[PDB]
Symmetry: C3
Subunit: 317 residues, 3 copies
């Protein structure tokens, strides 16, 4: 099946944020048995390995924006890799690494399918511009670089001249929001982006959130879907080993519902599994808990259903 044909890209990159260890995300996700578990689920899985992100020593800040040439290059190289996987007729599965890699993931995916819709699962909007940012971390800015409506608001940042905005504000849905910067909230409301913060999930229930998200993106016409999943989207009781955890997040069941509903569309075309940082567990079990939840979210993206699964064979004879 097209929805079960995968191209794995490891992107061990941490310089979009300050905490070391997120670069081990591809390693810990593979060691958890992701490839084997995917193959046991009737998936055709090709592993493109981990991208080498050669050191860029001498990468001074652009204003408060840290490591820009390193972040820019990593995303530029990932865009080329994602485009190759997309050309090979596979669902690009990016194992991060920090969320700044979404710049490259979505840009690369958009080169092959320019009509893609984005579902962004995260505690954060990640829509700061290099000028609205207060943390100066590029993993909090990927969405600003990608939006057509923000053209003329993105300054000339070293390492990013290759970027052209590919998604319109109307082609993205956020799910999970609970830690939005003032500057980010201004952008979000002014651009009229469709979002379901934790308030909307509490109000509507995840059932209605998915119904509305999939109608908003696919109601006009069936188009490819890019799911960009930041593990901090789930509550820290499920994915504690992450850089910026925020209280009162999506439950384990809610994360599974999102991905089960996205799978069922048969339109998943690109997936990012980001922000798993195995050096940030408070204990060894918090790390295994984080990686297992990330694996479980991923398997549901490729067909694993809680109601059960069977092959097209007669089990009674």
């Amino acid at each position: 099946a097209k929805s079960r044909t995968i191209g794995i890209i490891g992107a061990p990159f941490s310089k979009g944020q300050p905490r070391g260890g997120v670069e081990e995300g591809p390693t810990v996700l593979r060691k958890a048995g992701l490839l084997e578990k995917l193959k046991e689920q009737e998936c055709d899985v090709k592993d493109y390995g981990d991208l080498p992100f050669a050191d860029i020593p001498n990468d001074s800040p652009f204003q408060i924006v840290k490591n820009p040439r390193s972040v820019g290059k990593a995303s530029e190289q990932l865009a080329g890799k994602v485009a190759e996987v997309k050309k090979n007729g596979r669902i690009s599965l990016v194992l991060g690494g920090d969320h700044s890699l979404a710049i490259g993931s979505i840009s690369g995916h958009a080169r092959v399918h320019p009509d893609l819709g984005v579902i962004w699962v995260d505690a954060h909007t990640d829509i700061n511009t290099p000028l609205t940012t207060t943390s100066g971390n590029l993993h909090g800015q990927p969405v600003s670089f990608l939006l057509k409506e923000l053209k003329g608001k993105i300054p000339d940042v070293p390492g990013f001249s290759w970027v052209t905005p590919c998604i319109s504000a109307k082609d993205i849905v956020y799910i999970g929001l609970r830690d939005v910067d003032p500057g980010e909230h201004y952008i979000l409301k002014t651009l009229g982006i469709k979002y379901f913060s934790m308030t909307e999930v509490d109000r509507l229930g995840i059932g209605k959130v998915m119904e509305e998200t999939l109608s908003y993106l696919l109601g006009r016409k069936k188009r490819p879907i890019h799911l960009s999943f930041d593990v901090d989207g789930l509550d820290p009781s499920f994915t504690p080993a992450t850089g910026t955890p925020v209280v009162g997040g999506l439950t384990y069941r809610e994360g599974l519902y999102i991905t089960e509903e996205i799978y069922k569309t048969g339109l998943l075309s690109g997936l990012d599994i980001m922000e798993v940082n195995p050096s940030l567990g408070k204990t060894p079990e918090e790390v295994t808990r984080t990686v297992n939840t990330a694996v479980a979210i991923t398997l549901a993206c490729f067909g694993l259903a809680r109601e059960g699964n069977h092959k097209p064979i007669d089990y009674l004879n």
Copy 2:
């Protein structure tokens, strides 16, 4: 009152599964004061005691199916006892013991009430046949022995000759499914059984789940309800002292919501409280958490309401 008139049956049996200690379930539920608490809730309680299960020597497996004669005999004795309690106009309350016992519990109940409707609360379907099973554990096959649609599809297993299928595929509703084998999923779809897996619970909310469940079974006219409750139906954060725990289960709130709604119909006729394993707590608190939850569940089946309860007197006088 009929809905508060009970016959307690201890069923200290474990040989339907490989983990020892589930036979101690009737002991710890009794120790927690289940009987006294029910009597304090205006219930008429008659205790039929704990069934003696004789150790069957040379109980050789049937193909990969472990302990067949032991599981078949325990269910045979339990069917006779449930039928006796049912004949005395009481709600049979089986304290397990592993879920293979539901063969005896439901068969016995159907001998007095053949028009009964089953509600199965569990992470599992337990509908494997001796031929579709992969674990070979009989606590994962009771539904197959009971279904009229699977007559001719169940082999002649030693100890099960007394079994007569007593329920149709249309007479059962599952709630809480999240760990269903491919053969079980195939049976579940091909027979068109009604189920609310964790996916349906997330989509609908337990309110709509219970509305639809009760309308599906009762819509035609009032009929007896058999609730077969496996504590692993609830999330391991509420019932960790169980043999087969599965992540992402029904919350403590949802478990209470199911049972409070069933009580309200006034049609509860048979109840199974299964799979409590006090030797499977990682800490003594995990055992008490499990036992207290299983008691709360049972109390709600017989009238205990979170909004409160009052004796029919004037409290303001």
Copy 3:
């Protein structure tokens, strides 16, 4: 804005209940940065300080009712301070303290705004009379002293002659009930008070619960809202440092949802944050979790939103 104009009142009182330490509630809430966080959120914060509760020796019990004179005087003092805060055009914010103080807080609020409607967030109804109580603790009786319908059912208790019932049975909505005494349940049902016990919250979801509460209180016409928040309304996994924790409570997310919806009406006029007991946390982390949750609850009442907030300036300019 008026919905962001606050009058802080500390109420270090514990004699409404038998567990020491709840008088330290205004201290830890202050130490947590409450005032500073409200100011950061564009709030006009005036601190009216901590009320002085003078010791009353030889305060013999009325029948089984403990410390009556102490409770009576504390509420009497609070009523005058809340009435003063209300006349100065500010939302009253009472930092508790045990819930008996609600007598004082609501009576004082009603002196300036008689048409007020109450939303009572708690696991308990706190509607026992001095005659129906079984514990003898006045923190479980505030609602009965405030109700016009129970006028004639409240005996003459030492310290309470100043009390005039200011609310009808129709002007109050309960949210979170799950430990109601038989006497309270009789009161709740006979007076026909509107309530959302955990059962109703499970049935409908917090979204519908809030739509239902507000339509019931504000339907007829716009009126001032008094939110009396007992931290034990939320589950003990979120607010463990409380005197009367009850399992299966409101989630952290439901807590925030209730308060975000109350803020949006723009009609909040009185608030009580009660039963924070920093001496009851099993660990230092259990105290900080209860405190941080209580602080988060308070900020949402004054406009802190999970989708984000921004100032009326152009962030892109």
